[PDB]
Design a protein around this ligand. Structure first.
Ligand SMILES: O=C(O)C[C@H](C(=O)O)N1C(=O)/C(=C2/C(=O)Nc3ccc(Br)cc32)SC1=S
Ligand SMILES: O=C(O)C[C@H](C(=O)O)N1C(=O)/C(=C2/C(=O)Nc3ccc(Br)cc32)SC1=S
Ligand SMILES: O=C(O)C[C@H](C(=O)O)N1C(=O)/C(=C2/C(=O)Nc3ccc(Br)cc32)SC1=S
Ligand SMILES: CC(=O)NS(=O)(=O)c1ccc(Br)cc1
Ligand SMILES: CC(=O)NS(=O)(=O)c1ccc(Br)cc1
Lengths: 122, 122
């Protein structure tokens, strides 16, 4: 059997995030009513069922700008975008409802599950 | 502090690899003598110093085809591309030399070290 590098996935992830913070190869701008977020489409698709369906759409595949539902709050989206790239979720009793609703919309099932844990713990 | 999802990086990587095997959003063809490999530039850049330097070159940035040193054997490159996307390295006394040299060329330092320990072990 293959040697298994248990640290490889999170090294790739950390470099993807360094790519993003230096804006290298980012190929999409996510629009949330007024606010803008630069990302890599494959990372978005690897993290969210919604992005998977969007960029798997023959029509929408080649857009450089994607509008999401403009009722999404942008803070909740921002928290979720940093999570995608860092595996770290900034959850608090001050944002929990916003972040959870945005994760449901984005179809990020692990995050919605942990949000249910957090509600039940506090 | 932020809740840490210790399984996130590896679920992203497993979906990046499902994207690859369905050919979704692959945006580069790697040419290895005669053989062709499809991949996503950001994953190559996240995993290899060589691809980091290639796709960060303003001149080579937008190329859909990358030709590598024709002296690289394709089997050693193929094992290393699967590793990037799965974290599993198929190393054996039958390919160790090819894999190690291709890892050095691609500037994948963690793989190179492991190969060194594999040599030391047998
Ligand atoms: O069986 C199917 O046809 C796929 C099935 C679906 O959409 O019907 N599915 C997915 O592929 C989902 C994905 C996801 O959330 N991130 C991802 C990254 C790469 C790939 Br390929 C898929 C997903 S969620 C879902 S259901
Ligand atoms: O082409 C683009 O720039 C964006 C693209 C589209 O319409 O093809 N798009 C949307 O507008 C999307 C929405 C969504 O998911 N929920 C929503 C609620 C209200 C409104 Br108005 C829009 C959406 S998802 C998507 S892709
Ligand atoms: O100091 C610097 O400017 C960076 C330094 C360099 O090129 O001089 N360096 C890198 O950024 C290297 C990377 C790599 O192998 N995969 C990667 C993914 C994302 C990012 Br950002 C970097 C790498 S290897 C290297 S040396
Ligand atoms: C779900 C996750 O990433 N981690 S966790 O299981 O350790 C967890 C975190 C916070 C609360 Br409150 C309850 C559980
Ligand atoms: C410290 C630890 O074991 N895990 S953790 O960092 O993911 C964490 C869990 C719950 C909260 Br509430 C805040 C942090």
């Amino acid at each position: 059997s293959q040697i298994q590098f248990t640290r490889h996935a999170s090294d790739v992830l950390l470099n993807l995030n360094r790519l993003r913070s230096r804006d290298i190869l980012t190929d999409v701008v996510i629009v949330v009513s007024r606010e803008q977020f630069r990302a890599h489409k494959t990372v978005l698709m690897a993290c969210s069922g919604l992005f998977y369906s969007i960029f798997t759409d023959q029509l929408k595949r080649n857009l450089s700008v994607i509008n999401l539902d403009p009722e999404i709050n942008p803070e909740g989206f921002n928290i979720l975008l940093d999570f995608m790239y860092t595996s770290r979720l900034n959850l608090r009793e001050g944002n929990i409802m916003a972040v959870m609703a945005t994760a449901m919309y984005l179809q990020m099932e692990h995050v919605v599950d942990t949000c249910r844990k957090f509600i039940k713990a506090s």
